[PDB]
Design a protein around this ligand. Structure first.
Ligand SMILES: CC(=O)N[C@H]1[C@H](Oc2ccc([N+](=O)[O-])cc2)O[C@H](CO)[C@@H](O)[C@@H]1O[C@@H]1O[C@H](CO)[C@H](O)[C@H](O)[C@H]1O[C@@H]1O[C@@H](C)[C@@H](O)[C@@H](O)[C@@H]1O
Ligand SMILES: CC(=O)N[C@H]1[C@H](Oc2ccc([N+](=O)[O-])cc2)O[C@H](CO)[C@@H](O)[C@@H]1O[C@@H]1O[C@H](CO)[C@H](O)[C@H](O)[C@H]1O[C@@H]1O[C@@H](C)[C@@H](O)[C@@H](O)[C@@H]1O
Ligand code: NA
Ligand code: NA
Lengths: 302, 311
């Protein structure tokens, strides 16, 4: 099967770390930034990595059992199937927002009642001893004095981590999935800056909550979720060092810039000096697969 | 181009249990027939022709789906709607902004926040409620009305429905997610509503994909939200724009373990699926959820399907 990417404008595509439209395309503020996101990780032949779901339905949800009077949510997969501990960093689609406090909204499922607000607020710190999703559990800040059951929900807003005091949100990082006696197994590996004039491209969407900068919380990811779904369905074999893409204005068919899509599931470009980069481009463009290229192909600066 | 006008029709090669509802973002949890065999539906989301033409308020992707955005003044009850990206909603052009919820016959309990963040601390989340059968529910006219005065700063608010409950009026009536709200008013009805979808008859019945949405109802049961197409199908069709080459696309719902056909379905160009239930009580609800719909052939609308399920 021949390789393709979805024929949909970037601004209509979705973040792969949480369900939301993509609102920007950027380089990392630190040129040396290494990332290790667990969601939005997919080899371009359709192999999912880390905790990455095939589709948005599973993305950025948390599900588990909790007993009345406990602080611990014992995780399952989003569809209620058992989570196999020690195997993966966390259930598929589990949030990968590091360096922040999570303020979640959850509810008991299925409904078995004729009245009542089912929504419960809980908070999760990700750098504490009780945050051990790789062992199958996370700990809420407070005792959960609500009925025992199967709860499902998501993070509604984030704030600065409670500890160390004063530290800011840093969404370039992932939480500590592991425990005191065990590192998390099968983490999607780190992605390093490519060098040779190339730079990683990140797709960003704003997420609710405060921070020390009194500005939006911007969530960077490596691939639009629709690209992931496409690759999972298509399973097109990787036949070059990189897939050369053109970012095309669909109104005019003008090529706005060359990008490389690497087998590992990330995009690069060559910024044309400081100030230049993909953030200068309109967001109504569509990426188009042009050709497989070798390791010796040099991108035209953007 | 020649390639574009000859592009072969395809559907996403992903098991149903991994696909998403197109009326709100969630995994599909089942397939059902409508309890009433005469049920006509007119959902505004999850509506797409199989050549990629979006209908109603249907977004191309899940990013825009089931969101509400607008401006509200402190001390007011009126949310003046915009598109999800903050751009103006061109009223009269559509029933509502793209992705606007189409949950009829229920009270909406929403969570919204002021955007963008300009704070260094504080919970930004606000609870508001919306009734859909009241005078103030006029999304087609560009606004909806909250139950209570909004005593929070004037600004641009974004959010969604978090949970639903029975309509407040008429008192005692139940949630009915088969219905859409009245988008317009008595003086102005909603323009460019996606058209109704009617039972095909002659042995065929419409297939609905369901996902549970939080909240109570009179039956103490999950609020199962039915939709006509998985969202991934819609995104696929928008991207592919494959020409429709026949009356209907014959699909086989195939078991990935055995490669056996578990059921025959027809996908009609209007963007909905039918099957033939194998007697009373039989239907697609009896099939496992790990099957994959595979495109077999273009067929005539008169093509007869092998009955599905067991009586
Ligand atoms: C627990 C809490 O609400 N902490 C607030 C802190 O609140 C108060 C400070 C002092 C008094 N007092 O002297 O009487 C009373 C309340 O206020 C500061 C400044 O507004 C907040 O930053 C702080 O919020 C917490 O901050 C830490 C990081 O230091 C972390 O981000 C927590 O998640 C965050 O708590 C969350 O937000 C607050 C506003 C509240 O909604 C909590 O329920 C949330 O967990
Ligand atoms: C307004 C309200 O909360 N209505 C509740 C009702 O609440 C009360 C009952 C009695 C007293 N009192 O004696 O003083 C005070 C409040 O409680 C019944 C259950 O006994 C709920 O069914 C009712 O909830 C409302 O029900 C109507 C349909 O009849 C409709 O679904 C409303 O949306 C729903 O209100 C919502 O749920 C309640 C629980 C609450 O969360 C509200 O804020 C929601 O809007
Ligand atoms: Na940990
Ligand atoms: Na109305």
């Amino acid at each position: 099967r021949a390789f393709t990417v979805p024929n949909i404008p970037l601004q209509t595509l979705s973040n792969s770390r949480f369900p939301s439209l993509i609102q920007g395309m950027i380089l990392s503020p630190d040129a040396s930034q290494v990332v290790q996101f667990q969601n939005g990780r997919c080899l371009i032949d359709g192999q999912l990595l880390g905790t990455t779901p095939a589709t948005s339905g599973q993305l950025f949800r948390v599900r588990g059992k909790i007993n009345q009077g406990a602080r611990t949510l014992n995780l399952t997969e989003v569809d209620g199937k058992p989570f196999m501990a020690f195997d993966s960093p966390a259930p598929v689609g589990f949030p990968d927002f590091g360096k922040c406090d999570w303020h979640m909204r959850i509810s008991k499922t299925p409904n078995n009642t004729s009245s009542g607000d089912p929504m419960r607020s809980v908070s999760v710190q990700t750098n504490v001893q009780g945050f051990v999703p790789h062992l199958g559990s996370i700990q809420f800040d407070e005792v959960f004095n609500h009925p025992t059951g199967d709860y499902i929900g998501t993070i509604e807003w984030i704030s600065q981590p409670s500890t160390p005091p004063g530290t800011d949100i840093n969404l370039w990082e992932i939480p500590d999935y592991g425990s005191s006696l065990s590192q998390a197994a099968n983490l999607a590996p780190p992605v390093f800056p490519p060098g040779f004039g190339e730079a990683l491209v990140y797709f960003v969407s704003a997420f609710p909550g405060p921070n020390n900068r009194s500005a939006p919380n911007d969530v960077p990811c490596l691939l639009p979720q629709e690209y992931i779904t496409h690759f999972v369905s298509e399973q097109a074999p990787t036949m070059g060092d990189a897939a050369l893409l053109h970012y095309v204005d669909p109104d005019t068919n003008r090529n706005l810039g060359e990008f490389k899509l690497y087998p590992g599931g990330y995009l690069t470009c060559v910024p044309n000096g400081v100030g230049a980069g993909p953030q200068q481009l309109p967001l109504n463009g569509v990426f188009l697969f042009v050709s497989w290229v070798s390791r010796f192909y040099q991108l035209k600066p953007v």
